[PDB]
Amino acid sequence: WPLSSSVPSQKTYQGSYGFRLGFLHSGTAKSVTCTYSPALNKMFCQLAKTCPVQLWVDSTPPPGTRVRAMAIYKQSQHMTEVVRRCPHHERCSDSDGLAPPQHLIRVEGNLRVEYLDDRNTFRHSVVVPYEPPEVGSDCTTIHYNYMCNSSCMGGMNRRPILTIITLEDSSGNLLGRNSFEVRVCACPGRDRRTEEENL
Ligand SMILES: [Zn+2]
């Protein structure tokens, strides 16, 4: 696969709308589906399972705002390599009828989801309309699904990745950015507790 000639910025930018991310406070019981470590800024999740990510703003972005998610390798020497699904999963029969079979990150439960293969940078990304929080709610939740394990040979192959979440206006202008590390693994709860053990 062709390397990208560029690397997306991962610099945090709250912007005019005071944009940042939140995650459920899920703990590390062995049963948890998805769990986020504030100390590591790292989400631990399972293949193809719901991964809630919260959008928090201080003021409401204008109508037509969109929310984009994109993965990059965390290690500088792999950064120009496009993060994609391994050949095995690229060929498996788990299509949801909306997502490209090579894309690592999907969004579930949203029929307005849109996927992009960037024709210049080669990066994959997934975008949904920004929706303000339901009345009485403090944030907007997106349900992401990661469609390969961190260990997948011929794919991520045990290399750490970051998900970059950006807010953009209807014309593509950057309004906000935040990011977090992701490990897609068999037992998120155990793995988080173990990785934090090294602190
Ligand atoms: Zn895979």
Author numbering: 91 to 289
The publication says:
It functions primarily as a transcription factor by binding to specific DNA response elements as a homotetramer and integrates a multitude of cellular signals via protein–protein interactions to initiate the appropriate cellular response. This functional diversity and adaptability is provided through a complex domain structure, which comprises intrinsically unfolded N- and C-terminal extensions and linker regions that flank the structured DNA-binding domain (DBD) and tetramerization domain.
In order to elucidate the exact nature of the interaction detected by NMR, we solved the crystal structure of a DBD construct comprising residues 89–293 at 1.68 Å resolution. The crystals belonged to space group P21 with two molecules in the asymmetric unit. The overall structure of the β-sandwich and the DNA-binding region, including the zinc coordination sphere, is essentially the same as reported for the DBD variants with a shorter N terminus. A sharp turn within residues 94–96 facilitates this folding back of the N terminus against the L2 loop region of the DBD. The turn is stabilized via a hydrogen-bond network involving the hydroxyl group of Ser94, which is within hydrogen-bond distance of the main-chain oxygen of Thr211, the main-chain nitrogen and oxygen of Ser96 and a highly coordinated structural water molecule. Key in positioning the extreme N terminus is a cation–π interaction of the indole ring of Trp91 with the guanidinium group of Arg174, which packs in an approximately coplanar manner, the preferred geometry in protein structures. For the two preceding residues, Pro89 and Ser90, no electron density was observed, indicating that they are highly flexible and do not significantly interact with the folded region of the DBD but point away from the structured domain. The short segment around Trp91, although not essential for the overall structure of the DBD, contributes to the thermodynamic stability of the DBD by folding back against a nonnative surface patch on the canonical DBD region.
